[PDB]
Amino acid sequence: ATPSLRGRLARFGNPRKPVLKPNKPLILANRVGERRRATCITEMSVMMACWKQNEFRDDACRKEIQGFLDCAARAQEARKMRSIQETLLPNKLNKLLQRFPNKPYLS
Amino acid sequence: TKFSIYPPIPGEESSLRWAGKKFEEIPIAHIKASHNNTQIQVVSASNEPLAFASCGTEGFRNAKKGTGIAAQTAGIAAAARAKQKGVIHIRVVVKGLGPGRLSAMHGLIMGGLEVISITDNTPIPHNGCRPRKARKL
Amino acid sequence: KHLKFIARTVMVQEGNVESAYRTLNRILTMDGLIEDIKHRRYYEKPCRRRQRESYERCRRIYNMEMARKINFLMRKNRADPWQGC
Amino acid sequence: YHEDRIRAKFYSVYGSGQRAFDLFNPNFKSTCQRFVEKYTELQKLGETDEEKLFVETGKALLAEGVILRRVG
Amino acid sequence: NVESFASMLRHSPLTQMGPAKDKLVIGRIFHIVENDLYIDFGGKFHCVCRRPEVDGEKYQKGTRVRLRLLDLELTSRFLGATTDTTVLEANAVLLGIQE
Amino acid sequence: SNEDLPISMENPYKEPLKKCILCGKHVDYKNVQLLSQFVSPFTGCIYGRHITGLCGKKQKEITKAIKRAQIMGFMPVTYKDPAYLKDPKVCNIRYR
Amino acid sequence: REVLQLQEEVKNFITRENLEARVEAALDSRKNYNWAITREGLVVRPQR
Amino acid sequence: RFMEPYIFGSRLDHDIIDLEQTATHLQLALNFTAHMAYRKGIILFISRNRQFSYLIENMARDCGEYAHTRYFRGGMLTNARLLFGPTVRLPDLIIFLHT
Amino acid sequence: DPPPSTLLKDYQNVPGIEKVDDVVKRLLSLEMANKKEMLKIKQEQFMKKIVANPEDTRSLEARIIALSVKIRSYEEHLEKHRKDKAHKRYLLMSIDQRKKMLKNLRNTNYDVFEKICWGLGIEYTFPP
Amino acid sequence: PRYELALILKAMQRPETAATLKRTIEALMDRGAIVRDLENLGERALPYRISAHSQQHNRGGYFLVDFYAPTAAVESMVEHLSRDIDVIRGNIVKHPLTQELKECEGIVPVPLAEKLYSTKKR
RNA sequence: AAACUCAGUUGACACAAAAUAGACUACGAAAGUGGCUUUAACAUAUCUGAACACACAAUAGCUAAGACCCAAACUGGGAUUAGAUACCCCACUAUGCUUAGCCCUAAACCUCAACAGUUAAUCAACAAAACUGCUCGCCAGAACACUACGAGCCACAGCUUAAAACUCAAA
Ligand code: FES
Ligand SMILES: [Mg+2]
Ligand SMILES: [Mg+2]
Ligand SMILES: [Mg+2]
Ligand SMILES: [Mg+2]
Ligand SMILES: [Mg+2]
Ligand SMILES: [Mg+2]
Ligand SMILES: [Mg+2]
Ligand SMILES: [Mg+2]
């Protein structure tokens, strides 16, 4: 239940002092804001600790290195799949709102 | 029975156990995640200090203390000390939204110790003292 | 002075500390403690506190009204039933 | 309309029913409308107690064969 | 004796019906677009329900179905609007096919 | 003249106005069991009316009663009393 | 009625005479003001 | 606000247009339309209701008069001389099926 | 001040009120009531003593008497809460209102005005 | 008027508890209170540790003393309760039953605020 | 960097400030009022009515005595800087608090006076739609000017009232 606006704004016929002082008018706009914008560091830390304790000899850290590499590959795959899937959208939402726009005036 | 996220009530007859101990008797790992340092202290169920570890004591100095990596390092050190003092399962109480809040827990676990509970005891005055003034940069 | 380990305490299920921490942080956020601490770090002078509160109230009103409109119009996202004409 | 009182009481007492309205037929009569007609004729008989009228109308429709189910 | 508008309205099925909420009506699918079923139930507007996943193919133009109405017209007044915004379609729940 | 014209009356089809769950009931600072139904299980925070679903009057009554009990020693402050965690949930809050 | 009702009750008020007995009766008794509510507005009294 | 005189009353928040006024106004409108058609004027049917665009177009074509159910490019009437040609003849009557 | 044993205005007329337990009498007395009840008793006493028609309260006389009771209450209050600016303002405003009422009464019905002044111990002083 | 004294007494045995209740009701009657009823809500653990008169308390007995008193007696009774050592915490409140439950027909909803802004086109 | 060897757990403990409730919009004339309990208590059956008096008036500030957790003008130190009398970091004081007086200023602004009334033929622009009746206060180019003088004031680097001369065709 949206908060009431009865008697909240400084208006004539409103005895009490204003409750809200909206910087912008409280009128629904016909658009929505544009969607607003490290990975796999555990495996990296494991591999780097193994390197530190083994003098970075990859010979004795093969499992950790392979896990790190596969994790990076999966991170790339996740980025790609996420991008394609992301491609409701603000564009669609704005189109719908345009179809049914706000009317803050009299026709 | 079914799993409940709430802790058992002291004085109530509960079935949960850890290492043949009741919940009240599990040692407590007080984490303190300040803005630029993460301290850890594992006390017994009778507030007997067992292990200590802090970002500074781990060698980090200046800004490097306030890093999740430093928190993990301190947690691992504290967990090792507690493990050699004979601690398996711990109750974690962390007071502070410092950067080490969760990385300290991760380091503590990677040190071997198991966590049974997580408690937030961040001090939140009910409008008590007046904090220092804002920062204009 | 209250009993310890009853307030803001969560029990990890199977040892998934990450899940337990997520639940705890959800609790704190929904109760507002996180925002309260972030704001209490530095004293917010009463005028600024009132301005921020009023701004957040207006933002919530606008957001809730926009959400109501979006839900109300969501049923009209169908395909055009009179394509062409 | 004066029948609105009876309509509201009937809907509150028996719910919507099971005989769906067919708004396409101009001459359609809903179970509630039949109840209203029977209540109206009973009132025209000269019975003034509202609740007695209601129970009498319900029983008259039951005798007709209308299955008026009460909501609670 | 010529019935007037008042009498017609008084005896009309819509008037005989009370609030449309939770009222069962008989609609006639008059248009279908993929899985959307546009149903006319005698009211001003039409309700665009979805073809039920069960017995879906049985639903076709002219099919007579049963609806549980929720609003004869879907409208609401949003913040700042001087007039109600309408979606120009009724709201109903498609129960099934009448026989 | 004409009996088919509309008449001037109230709206007989009006639904009953919904009554808050506590409507008509006496909220008492001693009923810690009831007062604990509107406090966060973890932090003890009092729920807003958008969560409780109470009228303004009853929300104010619950607030005053909770504060009075907390300061008079009937009810814990920083947390909900564990003994009441299994009471019927009456708050539209989902922590999970 | 109000004065009449009060008249009846005053017979039960604790005085300097029936003080020991009433105190002991109070210590014996247990008064429960706790009762929860349900979403459907139905009281839930505790069991004793 | 201006439609109030023609509204018989609000049934459960649903306006009921006074069909008596509707009958009189429709009588006058049909009389005017027929008179223009007899006098051989140009009758243009305007309506943006896509649900009836096709029906309006077909009706206009069969009756021998013109129809514009599509997007109304600015100036079809004010700028007609330029958009079509200086000697174009504008409609003698415009009939709105949806104002 | 009326005697603490005095009964309240809602009980001084109850039949048989004197044939009840002294505990009931003490409960219904001013001894177990807030200051508003005592002020009501004072108001009714002044009315009986002064106004020709106590049952008429819309009269300027009844208004003046009630306002005088309120002035008494505010003065008693300030005597202890000397630093109550709000109630000091109320006292001054009520004195001004009573002066206006007394002016109107003196202009309209002199005999009644004289009786009001004598009964309430008010000395009408023409404004400078 | 009608007051209710909620009294958290030190956790003790029946003899001392009865003596303390007797002393408290005696103090009420001395200050001029007509004690109407005494109720025992029963001993229970204090929600939070209370330190009264150089003693940390975690359990206590809860008692309700409904009485009638002159207004000026409330302050004196509070002072005496503060003096008393067996009282972990005393509080005198106006009895809830003196207040009347106003009948709430329903939560009349506030419709959307209208005419906040001029209908001029912007 | 400077600063401290004070840091963590547990317990005891304020004359400081009053999370959540509050997505509530109430109280008061305005300033203001959001921990709890109690006492007293929120003027006017007609509206306006102070440079013409009375009573109030946030924060800051003075006087005298206490409290002092924290915050903090000034001050000192550490940085940053061409400089840094600032912004950033640390410490600490007046001060914020209680008592008794003073002081009587705020963008004290909802920049929208009080009362009664209308939504009809709109309305420079923006802002918080346009007006009617009645009353009081106020305004008459900019700047000089929250100024000088005179006057009053517990005010002594103050406050209230407050001009004029020169200047300009703008503001
Ligand atoms: S709903 Fe009736 S008191 Fe709130
Ligand atoms: Mg006046
Ligand atoms: Mg003035
Ligand atoms: Mg001042
Ligand atoms: Mg100091
Ligand atoms: Mg202000
Ligand atoms: Mg000045
Ligand atoms: Mg000056
Ligand atoms: Mg001078």
Q: Where are the domains of chain J?
A: 2-94
Range of the domain at F39: 2-96
Question: Which contiguous run of DSSP H or E holds residue J115?
Answer: none
Query: In Å, how far is G25's CA from the nearest CA of chain I?
Result: 23
Do the Cβ atoms of E13 and D22 come closer than 8 Å?
A: yes
Do the Cβ atoms of B41 and B85 come closer than 8 Å?
A: no
Instruction: Provide the β-strand partners of residue J94.
Output: J3
The resolution in Å comes to 3.3
Range of the domain at B4: 1-137
What are φ and ψ of residue D15, in 5° steps? Answer: 70, -165
Query: In Å, how far is B77's CA from the nearest CA of chain C?
Result: 19
- Residue C82 burial (CB count, 10 A): 13
Do the Cβ atoms of J35 and J92 come closer than 8 Å?
A: no
The bases of strand K with some atom under 7 A from any protein CB are 1, 7-14, 16-32, 35-45, 49, 54-57, 69-72, 87-90, 96, 100-101, 110-112, 122-123, 126-129
Q: Which residue of H has its CA nearest to E20?
A: H12
**List of chain B residues whose C-beta atoms are within 8 Å of the C-beta of residue F41:** 6
- Residue C28 burial (CB count, 10 A): 21
Q: Do A26 and C58 touch (CB under 8 A)?
A: yes
Here the contacts of H20-27 (C-beta below 8 Å, separation 24 or greater) are: H20/E4, H20/E5
Ligand 1, CB cutoff 6 Å, lining residues: F 19-20, 23, 55, 57-58; J 104, 106-107
**List of chain F residues whose C-beta atoms are within 8 Å of the C-beta of residue J108:** 17
Distance CA G10, CA I32 (A): 15
What dihedral angle (degrees, nearest 10) is formed by the CA atoms of J67, J70, J74, J76?
-120
Percentages helix, strand, coil for chain D (3-state, rounded to 5) are: 60, 0, 40
Three-class SS of residue B15? coil
Do the Cβ atoms of F32 and F69 come closer than 8 Å?
A: yes
- Residue D71 burial (CB count, 10 A): 9
Distance CA I99, CA I71 (A): 12
J53: its two tokens: 């008169």
Report the CATH fold assignment for J2-94.
Alpha-Beta Plaits (3.30.70)
Do the Cβ atoms of J2 and J66 come closer than 8 Å?
A: yes
Do the Cβ atoms of F18 and J107 come closer than 8 Å?
A: yes
Q: What's the domain count of chain B?
A: 1
Task: Name the residue among J45, G45, C23 with its Cα closest to residue F87.
Answer: G45
Amino acid type, J23: R
Query: Among F18, F52, F57, which residue has the most ligand 1 atoms within 8 Å of its CB, making it the best to mutate?
Result: F57
Tally of CA atoms within 13 A in the half-sphere of J83 that contains its CB: 9
Q: Give Cα H57 distance to the centre of its chain.
A: 12
Residues contacting J88, CB < 8 A, separation 6+:
F73, J8, J9, J10, J46, J50, J52, J57, J60
Q: Which residue of E has its CA nearest to F14?
A: E19
Cross-chain CB nearest to J68 (options I32, I34, I35): I32
- Residue F91 burial (CB count, 10 A): 15
Tally of CA atoms within 13 A in the half-sphere of A78 that contains its CB: 8
Q: Which letter does DSSP use for residue F14 in this model?
A: P
Whether F50 sits with its Cβ under 7 A from any strand K atom: the answer reads yes
Query: C-alpha angle with apex I31: I30 to I34, nearest 5 degrees?
Result: 65
- Residue B82 burial (CB count, 10 A): 26
Q: What's the domain count of chain F?
A: 1
Find which nucleotide's C1' atom is closest to C42's CA.
Answer: K71
Instruction: Provide the β-strand partners of residue F39.
Output: F46
Percentages helix, strand, coil for chain I (3-state, rounded to 5) are: 65, 0, 30
Distance CA H8, CA E5 (A): 10
Residues contacting G28, CB < 8 A, separation 6+:
J40
Cross-chain CB nearest to F90 (options G34, G38, G46): G38
